[PDB]
Amino acid sequence: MDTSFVGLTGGQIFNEMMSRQNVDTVFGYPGGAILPVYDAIHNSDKFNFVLPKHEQGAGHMAEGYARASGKPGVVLVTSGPGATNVVTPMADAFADGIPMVVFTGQVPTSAIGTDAFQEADVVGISRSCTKWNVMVKSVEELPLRINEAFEIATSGRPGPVLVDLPKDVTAAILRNPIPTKTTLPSSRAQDEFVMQSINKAADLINLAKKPVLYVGAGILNHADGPRLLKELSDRAQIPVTTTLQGLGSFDQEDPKSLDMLGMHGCATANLAVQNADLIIAVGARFDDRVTGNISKFAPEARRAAAEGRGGIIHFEVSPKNINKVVQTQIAVEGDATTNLGKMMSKIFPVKERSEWFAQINKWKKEYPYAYMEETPGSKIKPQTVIKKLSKVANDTGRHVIVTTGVGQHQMWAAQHWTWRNPHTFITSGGLGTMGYGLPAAIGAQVAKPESLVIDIDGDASFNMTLTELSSAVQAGTPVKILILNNEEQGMVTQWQSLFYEHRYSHTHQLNPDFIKLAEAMGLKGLRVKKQEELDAKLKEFVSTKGPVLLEVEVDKKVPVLPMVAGGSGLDEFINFDPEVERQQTELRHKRTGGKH
Amino acid sequence: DMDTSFVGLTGGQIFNEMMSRQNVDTVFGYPGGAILPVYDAIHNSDKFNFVLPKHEQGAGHMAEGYARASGKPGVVLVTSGPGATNVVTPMADAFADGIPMVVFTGQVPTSAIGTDAFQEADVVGISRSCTKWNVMVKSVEELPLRINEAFEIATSGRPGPVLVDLPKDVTAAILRNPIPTKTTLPQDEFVMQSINKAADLINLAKKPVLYVGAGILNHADGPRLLKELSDRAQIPVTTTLQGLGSFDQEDPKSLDMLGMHGCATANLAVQNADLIIAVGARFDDRVTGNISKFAPEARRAAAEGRGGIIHFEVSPKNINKVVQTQIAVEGDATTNLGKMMSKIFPVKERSEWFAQINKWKKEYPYAYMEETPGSKIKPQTVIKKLSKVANDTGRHVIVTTGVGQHQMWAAQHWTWRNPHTFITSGGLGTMGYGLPAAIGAQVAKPESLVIDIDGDASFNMTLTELSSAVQAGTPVKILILNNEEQGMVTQWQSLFYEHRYSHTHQLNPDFIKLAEAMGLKGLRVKKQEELDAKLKEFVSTKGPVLLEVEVDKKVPVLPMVAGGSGLDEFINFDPEVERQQTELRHKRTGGKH
Numbered sequence A: 001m002d003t004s005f006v007g008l009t010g011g012q013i014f015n016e017m018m019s020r021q022n023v024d025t026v027f028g029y030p031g032g033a034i035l036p037v038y039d040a041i042h043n044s045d046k047f048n049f050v051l052p053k054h055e056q057g058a059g060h061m062a063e064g065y066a067r068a069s070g071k072p073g074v075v076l077v078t079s080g081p082g083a084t085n086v087v088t089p090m091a092d093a094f095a096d097g098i099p100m101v102v103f104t105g106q107v108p109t110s111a112i113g114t115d116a117f118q119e120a121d122v123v124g125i126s127r128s129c130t131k132w133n134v135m136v137k138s139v140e141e142l143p144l145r146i147n148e149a150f151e152i153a154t155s156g157r158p159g160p161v162l163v164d165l166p167k168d169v170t171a172a173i174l175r176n177p178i179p180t181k182t183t184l185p186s187s188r189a190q191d192e193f194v195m196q197s198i199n200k201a202a203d204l205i206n207l208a209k210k211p212v213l214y215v216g217a218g219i220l221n222h223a224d225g226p227r228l229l230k231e232l233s234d235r236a237q238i239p240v241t242t243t244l245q246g247l248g249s250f251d252q253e254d255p256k257s258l259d260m261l262g263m264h265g266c267a268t269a270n271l272a273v274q275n276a277d278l279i280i281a282v283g284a285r286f287d288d289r290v291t292g293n294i295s296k297f298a299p300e301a302r303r304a305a306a307e308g309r310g311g312i313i314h315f316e317v318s319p320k321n322i323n324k325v326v327q328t329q330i331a332v333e334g335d336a337t338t339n340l341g342k343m344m345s346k347i348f349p350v351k352e353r354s355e356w357f358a359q360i361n362k363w364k365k366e367y368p369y370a371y372m373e374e375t376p377g378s379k380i381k382p383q384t385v386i387k388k389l390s391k392v393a394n395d396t397g398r399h400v401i402v403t404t405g406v407g408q409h410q411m412w413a414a415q416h417w418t419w420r421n422p423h424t425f426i427t428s429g430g431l432g433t434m435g436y437g438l439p440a441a442i443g444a445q446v447a448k449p450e451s452l453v454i455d456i457d458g459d460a461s462f463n464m465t466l467t468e469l470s471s472a473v474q475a476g477t478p479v480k481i482l483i484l485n486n487e488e489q490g491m492v493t494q495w496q497s498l499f500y501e502h503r504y505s506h507t508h509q510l511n512p513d514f515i516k517l518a519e520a521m522g523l524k525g526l527r528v529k530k531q532e533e534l535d536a537k538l539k540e541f542v543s544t545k546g547p548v549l550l551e552v553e554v555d556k557k558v559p560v561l562p563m564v565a566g567g568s569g570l571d572e573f574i575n576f577d578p579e580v581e582r583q584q585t586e587l588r589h590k591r592t593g594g595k596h
Numbered sequence B: 001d002m003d004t005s006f007v008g009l010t011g012g013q014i015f016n017e018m019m020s021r022q023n024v025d026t027v028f029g030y031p032g033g034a035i036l037p038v039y040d041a042i043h044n045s046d047k048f049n050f051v052l053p054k055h056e057q058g059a060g061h062m063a064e065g066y067a068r069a070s071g072k073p074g075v076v077l078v079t080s081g082p083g084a085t086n087v088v089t090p091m092a093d094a095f096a097d098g099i100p101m102v103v104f105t106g107q108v109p110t111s112a113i114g115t116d117a118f119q120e121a122d123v124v125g126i127s128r129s130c131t132k133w134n135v136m137v138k139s140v141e142e143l144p145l146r147i148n149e150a151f152e153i154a155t156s157g158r159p160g161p162v163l164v165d166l167p168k169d170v171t172a173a174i175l176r177n178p179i180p181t182k183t184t185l186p187q188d189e190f191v192m193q194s195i196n197k198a199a200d201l202i203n204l205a206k207k208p209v210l211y212v213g214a215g216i217l218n219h220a221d222g223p224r225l226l227k228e229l230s231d232r233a234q235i236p237v238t239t240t241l242q243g244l245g246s247f248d249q250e251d252p253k254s255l256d257m258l259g260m261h262g263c264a265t266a267n268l269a270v271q272n273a274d275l276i277i278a279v280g281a282r283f284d285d286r287v288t289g290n291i292s293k294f295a296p297e298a299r300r301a302a303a304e305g306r307g308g309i310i311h312f313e314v315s316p317k318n319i320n321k322v323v324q325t326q327i328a329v330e331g332d333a334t335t336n337l338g339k340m341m342s343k344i345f346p347v348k349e350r351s352e353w354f355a356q357i358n359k360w361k362k363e364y365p366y367a368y369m370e371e372t373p374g375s376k377i378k379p380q381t382v383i384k385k386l387s388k389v390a391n392d393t394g395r396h397v398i399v400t401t402g403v404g405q406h407q408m409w410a411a412q413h414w415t416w417r418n419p420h421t422f423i424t425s426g427g428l429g430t431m432g433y434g435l436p437a438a439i440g441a442q443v444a445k446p447e448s449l450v451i452d453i454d455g456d457a458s459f460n461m462t463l464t465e466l467s468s469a470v471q472a473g474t475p476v477k478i479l480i481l482n483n484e485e486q487g488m489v490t491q492w493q494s495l496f497y498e499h500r501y502s503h504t505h506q507l508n509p510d511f512i513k514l515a516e517a518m519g520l521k522g523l524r525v526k527k528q529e530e531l532d533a534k535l536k537e538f539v540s541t542k543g544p545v546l547l548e549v550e551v552d553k554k555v556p557v558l559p560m561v562a563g564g565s566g567l568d569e570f571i572n573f574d575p576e577v578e579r580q581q582t583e584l585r586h587k588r589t590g591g592k593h
């Protein structure tokens, strides 16, 4: 038994457990139900507290913080609307496997189930969007629940967890000693089984003639992931493609880089995947934005599997994602990085793959990320902004972190930025939450105070959570907000152009003056609309001390390409064509009655 | 038998038709991938108007505002995933306050459900505890049916929110086969017995009190029949926060609002009443105070079989849920009041009762520290002044609010006289409700003067909707009582946590520059001398306008009943005590506050 907490309130015990869980930052917003805990963390030296203007912001900040630091993001909000306001961030963290512990205040246990003031069944509401949740029934179990929450959030596939805290529990004084284990954080047959699958994976890899590494976020859940990935890639001469969430795990400057695959992935990455005899999936879940039409996915690997000379190998940590989308030949369970390390010595060094590399190189010259570049008098092109910013940012020599909103700017940031470092791309992929950009950048900056943190946002996405601009000033986070303003919900207008004969239904919102907004919010505001001024503005943007927002007026109705949609296979993509763009433009003006 | 007027139409087009059949004139929403088939079908629709916010939460609260002001259900149309999760707060809010709302959420194709698909969420599971009912349309054939069930459920019994999940493949699907025409178109003695006994118990009451809530506002004749009964039987009327506007506060029988921050007279009358006639109210914990101390005299009158509590409630689940009642009249309150009217004996006077009540009103008025030469503007003063200035316009006035002290002061110091003119978040108490609700109300009543009395912290929650007001053409008047703090929380911290202000002070943006950046006029007032002129220019402005009034900080809302206190054990205002508290606050915060 442990009696060291006897005499303390639940709130004080909460405060105490934070330092035991190595928590240095908490994102939250005060409220009645959670007051006992706030009174306990008042002036606390155990951690920095970050206050947003809206709980959703606290949630996204916590995600960005977790994505940038590798530590779970901690949220502390009140009951009722406080808790319902964090459902989106939880669903978002759940989709992208982000470690987060959400503490929600709750009405007194005696008022639960009486439709009490600011009462919500948060445990019920968040059941499907948390790896686990619970309502603390007594102060005696507060330490146990906190410890279980942190452990569950950061293990297996990371994810969000919620802990409901009744006000009478946090205000209550602990009058009983409690088990020592509940107050302290944290099979040979199985090991042999994993080692057996590792040997099978090695044998299969040593047999491959056209292998491809399909890499995702999982490789970033271990400090040595990128390093071991590169070792394997070099040792067996295997080209590497990453998902949107795997960007930064592999140096794109390396000859063996295939760039991103998927719906809007590089044509070369998609073609390599469709023609590979062996796909080595590492920390990726084969989501529907990556596979294209599943029945058309990886035909050559499927053919090789039927002939027992290839197929798909999957390094997955969660049983839920093993053989959930496609049949795999070998599943290596557990942490990918760890398993890559164990397999390495069994992989035969390869001298070269001239044919495979030659084929891949022909595709690279044939299918670059082409787009309609600037022309005299034309508006600035969004893709051009990303390419230029990437260069300017990288040249500073500083550690760079990029967050984004959801939409075309997001895809263009993914395609045209040159990814080289682990944990430098923080974006909402699974749930695709517009508004993620700003708050995520604020959280990321708190995690890495010395990094140059850039939010490449869209105008519609930015509007969702622009109130957090004042939070950036109050928090002292010198974030660089970039708004690629096309005065439209681009992602949606693109789909409307393609599948709904150019009928833009409610996808054009009236924007506020972003520069005046920035100034009203307390930061520097910059705007650029002329090609000749882009370079200077990007320069000023990056070198400005303090938070700053830069709006770039960009061309409208520009589609993201290449694109694989509907029943198309990864190799049946739409490619950029200047002539077609011009024809589609004319067709658009007619159909919209000249409105767009 | 079978109907074919929809055959050949996509689910989206059917949705468009159903809005017309349901007499929907306004839809609030935000487009997204999964819901595109529907947005395509309503593209340039003349069946109704569309209002676009910057965030789905805005659409939700706008729809609530619309519903509260119009009496019609608020219709929401959003996409799957984040679109759906972003409307959970508004649904929980509507669920708490019984607001009719039909939320349509796009969903990924039925062939993608259960595969952790792009932007997929278990919306039906998430919103279960926040909706009276929800469902996922499995085929286009059942779309007309599900829509009709949704609107019916949302507008029946106690109004509330409902959600209809729409898979993209279902809304894109074309109706091939005809569907039942029925699915395409939109004891009794116990009640009468209760009405009779209720009438008798009332005719026997010596110190009756009408405890009125939002229920009376759910019927067009509610306020009228309430007045009739009040006059006929000469019964004093007190209303909850959600009942404000259902009774003319200019009438001598008005006891004003009761509860945690209700008028002392109202609370005293309730504690001394021998009979409490609860009409469309649910005895929430913000009204009853310490439950065991609630209505002590009514309980005694009940033990002596000469009084007690009569409850006109439409929801059986809310009867005898908080306190045991003697008589329960199930069904619509307004309807049952009309049936009981004749059985009520016309009382000519209640001298003794009204005498006691009148001396309480003279001894316990909404007192507060008024302005002094050189001091800051007082919050309560702004409300009283604006109340008159707004009234003198002669226009129909609708008031919305955020959550906190400004909300309570607005409730207390405004003179309520018209039904459906006070739109505030009470059950869930959602900060940020003010602006989007106002915008929604303005849409419901284009000719009305809509004023949002907000708090600085509350305003910050959803201020992005300012640009939405401009795009929607809603000339809302936004008033911000800026005390640069989370007033209601700092009050509790001052009272229960020895002035330890833990993270209750957020850094505010420049509200005037913000308003201008958003496309509307911005005004600011700091001096007492400019208040009157500013308030006049404020309500006189043609388009949407924002007015920030710098008010005094750390000002407590009184009277107050909290903790284990009874409605009669309230904390009354005292000028000397406020000065002593100010000195204590300074010494404890090192002069910071």
Ligand SMILES: Cc1cc2nc3c(=O)[nH]c(=O)nc-3n(C[C@H](O)[C@H](O)[C@H](O)COP(=O)(O)OP(=O)(O)OC[C@H]3O[C@@H](n4cnc5c(N)ncnc54)[C@H](O)[C@@H]3O)c2cc1C
Pocket (backbone or CB within 6 Å): A095, A096, A097, A156, A157, A158, A215, A216, A217, A218, A219, A221, A222, A242, A243, A244, A245, A246, A260, A261, A262, A263, A264, A265, A282, A283, A284, A285, A286, A287, A289, A290, A315, A316, A317, A318, A321, A334, A335, A336, A337, A406, A407, A411, A428, A429, A430, A431, A432, A491, B118
């Ligand atoms: C507009 C839009 C367009 C998009 N277009 C694309 C596109 O074209 N291409 C694309 O790639 N994505 C795209 N996405 C993102 C996409 O939805 C998915 O979020 C992303 O592809 C998922 O990548 P992931 O599988 O690598 O990561 P996750 O979804 O996080 O999945 C990681 C997988 O790794 C496993 N794993 C986790 N940790 C470990 C560990 N330690 N050891 C071993 N295994 C582990 C997990 O449990 C899981 O199965 C788009 C999103 C949006 C919003």
Ligand SMILES: Cc1cc2nc3c(=O)[nH]c(=O)nc-3n(C[C@H](O)[C@H](O)[C@H](O)COP(=O)(O)OP(=O)(O)OC[C@H]3O[C@@H](n4cnc5c(N)ncnc54)[C@H](O)[C@@H]3O)c2cc1C
Pocket (backbone or CB within 6 Å): A117, B096, B097, B098, B157, B158, B159, B212, B213, B214, B215, B216, B218, B219, B239, B240, B241, B242, B243, B257, B258, B259, B260, B261, B262, B279, B280, B281, B282, B283, B284, B286, B287, B312, B313, B314, B315, B318, B331, B332, B333, B334, B403, B404, B407, B408, B425, B426, B427, B428, B429, B430, B488
């Ligand atoms: C900061 C803050 C402070 C607050 N302070 C106070 C305070 O001091 N005093 C106070 O009064 N409130 C206060 N509240 C509001 C409070 O939480 C409750 O929302 C409000 O008191 C509920 O009033 P109501 O019962 O009238 O309406 P509802 O909560 O909507 O309940 C209505 C009841 O009427 C029934 N009914 C509905 N329609 C009909 C019909 N057609 N026929 C018959 N019955 C029907 C319902 O089903 C239900 O039981 C506060 C809220 C906040 C945010």
Ligand SMILES: COC(=O)c1ccccc1S(=O)(=O)NC(=O)Nc1nc(C)cc(C)n1
Pocket (backbone or CB within 6 Å): A031, A032, A033, A079, A106, A107, A108, A111, A116, A117, A118, A167, B285, B488, B489, B492, B563
């Ligand atoms: C949050 O409500 C409950 O938890 C809650 C719910 C039902 C009963 C009792 C409580 S309570 O008595 O434990 N706490 C409060 O009532 N708190 C509170 N109330 C107001 C009006 C403003 C602020 C800041 N805090």
Ligand SMILES: COC(=O)c1ccccc1S(=O)(=O)NC(=O)Nc1nc(C)cc(C)n1
Pocket (backbone or CB within 6 Å): A288, A491, A492, A495, A566, B032, B033, B034, B080, B107, B108, B109, B112, B117, B118, B119, B168
């Ligand atoms: C919303 O997703 C699904 O419903 C969804 C989910 C899984 C599979 C298929 C779909 S889909 O093929 O029926 N629709 C889309 O994929 N839509 C879409 N995708 C993007 C990237 C941007 C926009 C605007 N719409």
Ligand SMILES: CCCOP(=O)(O)OP(=O)(O)O
Pocket (backbone or CB within 6 Å): B402, B403, B404, B405, B406, B407, B431, B454, B455, B456, B457, B458, B459, B481, B483, B485, B486, B487, B488, B489
């Ligand atoms: C519970 C919220 C408080 O903050 P806000 O600034 O909105 O209002 P007030 O300060 O009037 O209580």
Ligand SMILES: [K+]
Pocket (backbone or CB within 6 Å): A252, A259, A414, A415, A416, A417, A418, A419
């Ligand atoms: K790239």
Ligand SMILES: [K+]
Pocket (backbone or CB within 6 Å): B249, B256, B411, B412, B413, B414, B415, B416
């Ligand atoms: K009043």
Ligand SMILES: [Mg+2]
Pocket (backbone or CB within 6 Å): A407, A458, A459, A460, A484, A485, A486, A487, A488, A489, A490
């Ligand atoms: Mg845009």
Ligand SMILES: [Mg+2]
Pocket (backbone or CB within 6 Å): B404, B455, B456, B457, B458, B481, B482, B483, B484, B485, B486, B487
């Ligand atoms: Mg305030």
